[PDB]
Ligand binder design. Structure first.
Ligand code: 6VS
Ligand code: NAG
Length: 331
């Protein structure tokens, strides 16, 4: 087909990027993260007990208000790094960027207050492959592709730094307004995962010396590595570990070295301004780093993950026809 389509994103505090989709007839609207690190669509459900406080604070999908709903009921549990959601399968028409698609998705009935009370978004639209879909449920982008409307079998992510357009996902191509220079492509190394070979992580190559893996994860806020790798990285930066993050004396933030990720021959460099939440310059304040430990079990990991920290600097094209990821300088 001839169409490309776009989804406008909201940037909450540089940590959460999400857009709007519609589900059902008439459309019920949900804030959703578009997540290349997972493959299932889910939203919180009206059948979620309100003893889950996360279900009191998010928009709930009521299948009883949709005339296009089709029951399935297969129970599924989706295990993420920071928490788990559980529910049952449903089918309805989903509207994303003005493209309409019949889509199987999860109605979440069990949604833990931590971490999900911290989510601005209601749910997740997985942009991954059918291979990592729980229940082998056909992902939304595979269903969009089956319509033959998209110009290209690709989608692209722009995450703005400004917290104005928060971001943009192009379905069926890319947007030249939000990148510059050439794309550099790295082909995927594992079946059904948006994952690439990484050849080194430099700090001012201290880590990933004999190669490692990098997941390009649009649904993650930060750059992550294994607890071991990050502990080494953070010793090199002089950062202190806390419960859920690494921090430095805010005055030390602008003195911190460049972090470089060796991907497909090129070096992808983040400066301190790219990975330090510089909320103060005080020696008596602590400043959080957009880099945390996240141990990912096999078969996906151990692996680094490149989240919004990375994507903010590098406009990312996800190419399904040629199984590759393209990076260009974001503008
Ligand atoms: C750019 O917008 C950022 C949105 C904020 N994202 C998160 N917010 C929270 C808060 C709720 C705290 C806000 N918690 C966690 C995340 C999070 O990073 N993810 C999950 C949620 C989208 C539900 C990863 C998504 N991609 C698969 C990641 C995985 O689980 N794995 C990597 C691939 O292999 C399997 C494991 C998890
Ligand atoms: C109750 C119900 O509709 N269950 C369906 C089943 O009929 C179907 O075989 C399967 C498709 O994978 O999804 C589930």
């Amino acid at each position: 087909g001839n169409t490309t389509s776009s989804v406008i994103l909201t940037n909450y505090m540089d940590t959460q990027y999400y857009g709007e989709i519609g589900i059902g007839t008439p459309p019920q609207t949900f804030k959703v993260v578009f997540d290349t690190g997972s493959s299932n669509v889910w939203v919180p459900s009206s059948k979620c007990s309100r003893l889950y406080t996360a279900c009191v604070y998010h928009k709930l999908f009521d299948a009883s208000d949709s005339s296009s709903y089709k029951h399935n009921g297969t129970e599924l549990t989706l295990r993420y790094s920071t928490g788990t959601v559980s529910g049952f399968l449903s089918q309805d028409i989903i509207t994303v960027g003005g493209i309409t698609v019949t889509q199987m998705f999860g109605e979440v009935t069990e949604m833990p207050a931590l971490p999900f009370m911290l989510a601005e978004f209601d749910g997740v639209v997985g942009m991954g492959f059918i291979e990592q879909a729980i229940g082998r449920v056909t992902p939304i982008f595979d269903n969009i592709i089956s319509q033959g409307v998209l110009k290209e079998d690709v989608f692209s992510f722009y995450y703005n730094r400004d917290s104005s357009l928060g971001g943009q996902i192009v379905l069926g191509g890319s947007d030249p307004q939000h990148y510059e220079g050439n794309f550099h492509y790295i082909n995927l190394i594992k079946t059904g995962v948006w994952q690439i070979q990484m050849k080194g992580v430099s700090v001012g190559t201290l880590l990933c010396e004999d190669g490692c893996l990098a997941l390009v994860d649009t649904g993650a806020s930060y750059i992550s590595g294994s607890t071991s790798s990050i502990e080494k990285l953070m010793e090199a930066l002089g950062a202190k570990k806390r419960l859920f993050d690494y921090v430095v004396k805010c005055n030390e933030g602008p003195t911190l070295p460049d972090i470089s990720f060796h991907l497909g021959g090129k070096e992808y460099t983040l400066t301190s301004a790219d990975y330090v939440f510089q909320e103060s310059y005080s020696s008596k304040k602590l400043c959080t780093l957009a880099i945390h430990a996240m141990d990912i079990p096999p078969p996906t990991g151990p692996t680094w993950a490149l989240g919004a920290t990375f994507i903010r600097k590098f406009y990312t094209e996800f190419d399904r026809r040629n199984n590759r990821i393209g990076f260009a300088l974001a503008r």
